[PDB]
């Protein structure tokens, strides 16, 4: 039990209400005070003028803390010899001598504590606990260099073999270790202490006794070694447990139920930290990218407009046929970076070097297609602009534009959005303090450059280029053609689902080891669904397949999922497009993992044993080299 102790308020052993209990202090138990400490560590001052005398509370110590601090002290006890050499902490802390055993009421609140009377509970004050932690922490602090040098000595040559046993005369090891160990090391100064510490840590190292003669194993950690050791037919126990636990953690993180829901799920609960994406706006096709607009082509009347930024400077620019813009409505916050490096934009009538390119934002109630003569432009200002530079190009008699990082942040909250009729647009093009004659400059825009978009929110999700408030994860399966996937926005739901499913794929690969066309517990869920579905009645010609064909198809489905985790999204996928298969696999993964009973696969075990035996052989060869090049007397 934990919490704090409670005592009666003086009543004659008749406590019938939580109003007759008060919290215990060190005056009620005088042995828990600061002056009654045994002070074997010398921490508390002996001067009577320096030791305080005030009332501190009490807390209850639980068995978990007792055992863990008791093992923390044995961590220090691994190095008693060097600690003796520096005259540090001559007496072991012995946590159990700090607690006080009292029969009292135990609890966090009085109402609970009243109905719970316990006998022989251990209590302590905060001050003594802090002192004990400080003593261990100081003893640990005094051993940093010694531990590092000890680890260097252990790791200089292999002292552990994966399986079996190896050997070497110790004189050869000592000669090599004298030859190679650093001069700064404390091993050279204090050899015997290091020898005893290594003999305690490692059971392999055994020191013969000159007085008597008996040489024997003296390590203190054999049980943990047996927990790590491999049997001659199976891997170690601890490694299997660790692997299965890691796979379970991945499945838990992937949220198998969120990605298999048949009812709408809110956007913030479905989302994950996104990634930026790159595009070329000019090269996109407008019927695929639903988030672009373009003025009708074959128009034969270019027009010019003027526009002023937030400093009032006037700028001239021209719109022509083919000019493209981007809808800035219903796309959530987003950051744009545009880079024109490597492109020319060179004509005989216009040279880019020294010119300026800018982002221009338009607000108007008229669709961008129906624009002409500058009367339809509406309210507009320049956001940002930058000046270009030209350099020689690999192609002879041409030149290219140096790098740029033209940036703009779109935050939907600031703009008024008062009239739903209103439309917002964004464009990038040349601007100049002199009017650009249409004959000289013919390029519709400068959208022929690399464009990186990064989301500015983590609770916003779109589909196909328009934001939604909720999604049904089971309705995204098999609904994207490849062309619609390279034109979606970085905050798309498909990317979130793919990234969530990648963890399921990783967990399955970690747990399962099956070759081509072999059944596994993680591939039969598809098989049962395939059988039941092929029995049913829909429309069209039925085909019946035996159990072997179905098993092969299910295995191929699972492999195609693991290798490429975005097939669930892809339209017209062979078998993984159906939502039943996805739901069955996702649900069955948890049951498959939870019912392992400390086991592994046959192929893994056999390969692992062969590998370990090869490792011992190589280790033995190296030790033969060492014993041969450093002869013993």
């Amino acid at each position: 039990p934990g919490g704090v102790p409670w005592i009666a308020v003086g009543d004659e052993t008749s406590v019938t209400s939580p109003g007759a209990l008060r919290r215990m202090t060190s005056k009620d138990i005088p042995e828990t005070a600061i002056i009654n400490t045994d002070n074997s560590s010398g921490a508390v001052p002996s001067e009577s003028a320096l030791v305080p005398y005030i009332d501190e509370p009490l807390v209850v110590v639980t068995e978990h803390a007792i055992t863990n601090f008791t093992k923390a002290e044995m961590a220090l006890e691994f190095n008693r010899e060097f600690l003796d050499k520096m005259r540090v902490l001559s007496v072991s802390p012995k946590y159990s001598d700090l607690l006080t055993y009292v029969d009292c009421y135990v609890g966090v609140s009085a109402r609970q504590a009243l109905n719970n009377f316990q006998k022989q509970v251990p209590v302590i004050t905060p001050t003594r606990q802090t002192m004990y932690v400080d003593s261990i922490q100081a003893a640990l602090k005094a051993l940093e260099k010694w531990e590092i040098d000890l680890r260097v000595a252990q790791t200089l040559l292999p002292t552990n073999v994966p399986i079996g046993e190896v050997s070497c005369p110790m004189q050869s090891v000592v000669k090599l270790l004298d030859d190679q160990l650093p001069d700064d090391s404390l091993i050279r100064r204090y050899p015997k202490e290091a020898a005893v510490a290594l003999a305690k840590r490692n059971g392999g190292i055994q020191w013969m006794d000159v007085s008597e003669g008996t040489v024997m194993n003296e390590a203190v950690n054999a049980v943990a070694a047996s927990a790590l050791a491999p049997s001659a037919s199976a891997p170690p126990l601890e490694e299997k447990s660790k692997l299965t636990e890691q796979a379970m953690d991945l499945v838990t993180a992937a949220e198998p139920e969120i990605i298999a829901s048949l009812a709408p799920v809110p956007a913030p609960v479905f989302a994950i930290p996104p990634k930026p994406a790159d595009y070329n706006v000019r090269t996109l096709r407008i019927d695929e990218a639903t988030w672009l607009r373009m003025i009708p082509k074959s128009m034969n009347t270019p027009f010019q407009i003027q526009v002023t930024d937030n400093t009032g400077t006037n700028w001239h620019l021209n719109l022509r046929g083919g000019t493209r813009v981007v809808n800035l409505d219903q796309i959530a916050p987003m950051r744009f970076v545009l880079d024109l490096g490597g492109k020319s934009y060179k004509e005989t009538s216009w040279d880019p070097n020294g010119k300026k390119v800018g982002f221009i934002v338009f607000q108007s109630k008229i669709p961008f297609e129906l624009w002409t003569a500058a009367s339809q432009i509406g309210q507009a200002t320049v956001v940002n602009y930058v000046q270009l530079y030209a350099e020689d190009s690999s192609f002879t008699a041409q030149s290219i534009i140096a790098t740029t990082s033209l940036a703009y942040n779109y935050e939907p909250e600031q703009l008024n959005k008062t009239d739903p009729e209103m439309n917002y647009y964004l464009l990038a093009t040349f601007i100049d303090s002199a009017a650009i004659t249409p004959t000289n400059m013919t390029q519709p825009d400068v959208w022929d450059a690399l464009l990186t978009m990064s989301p500015l929110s983590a609770g916003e999700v779109t589909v196909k280029g328009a934001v939604v408030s909720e999604v049904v994860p089971a309705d995204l399966i098999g609904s994207y053609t490849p062309e619609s996937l390279n034109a979606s926005l970085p905050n798309d739901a498909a990317r979130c689902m793919i990234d969530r499913a990648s963890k399921i794929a990783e967990a399955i690969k970690i747990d399962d080891d099956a070759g081509p066309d072999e059944y596994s517990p993680n591939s039969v869920p598809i098989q049962g669904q395939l059988a039941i579905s092929q029995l049913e009645t829909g429309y069209g010609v039925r085909i019946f397949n035996p159990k072997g064909i179905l098993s092969k198809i299910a295995s191929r489905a699972m492999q195609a999922f693991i290798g490429d985790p975005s097939t669930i999204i892809t339209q017209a996928a062979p078998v993984l497009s159906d939502k039943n298969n996805w739901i069955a696999l996702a649900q069955g993964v948890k049951t498959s993992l939870r019912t392992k009973s400390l086991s592994a696969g046959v192929k893994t075990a056999v390969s692992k044993l062969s590998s370990s035996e090869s490792i011992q052989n190589w280790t033995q060869g190296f030790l033969d080299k060492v014993s041969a090049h450093f002869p013993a007397p």
Binding site: P126, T130, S241, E245, R594
Partner: protein
């Protein structure tokens, strides 16, 4: 928090003598997590 009043009371949120003095040796936790593994519990 807030301000209030009662005829008889034990502590004064808006009163004098209260201490607010964060420390490293004090810290603040409630119950962030517990170990409920299926292998451990049977």
């Amino acid at each position: 928090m807030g301000n209030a009043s009662s005829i008889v009371q034990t502590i004064n949120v808006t009163g004098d003598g209260n201490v607010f003095k964060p420390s490293a040796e004090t810290s603040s936790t409630a119950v962030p997590s517990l170990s409920l593994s299926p292998g451990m519990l049977n």
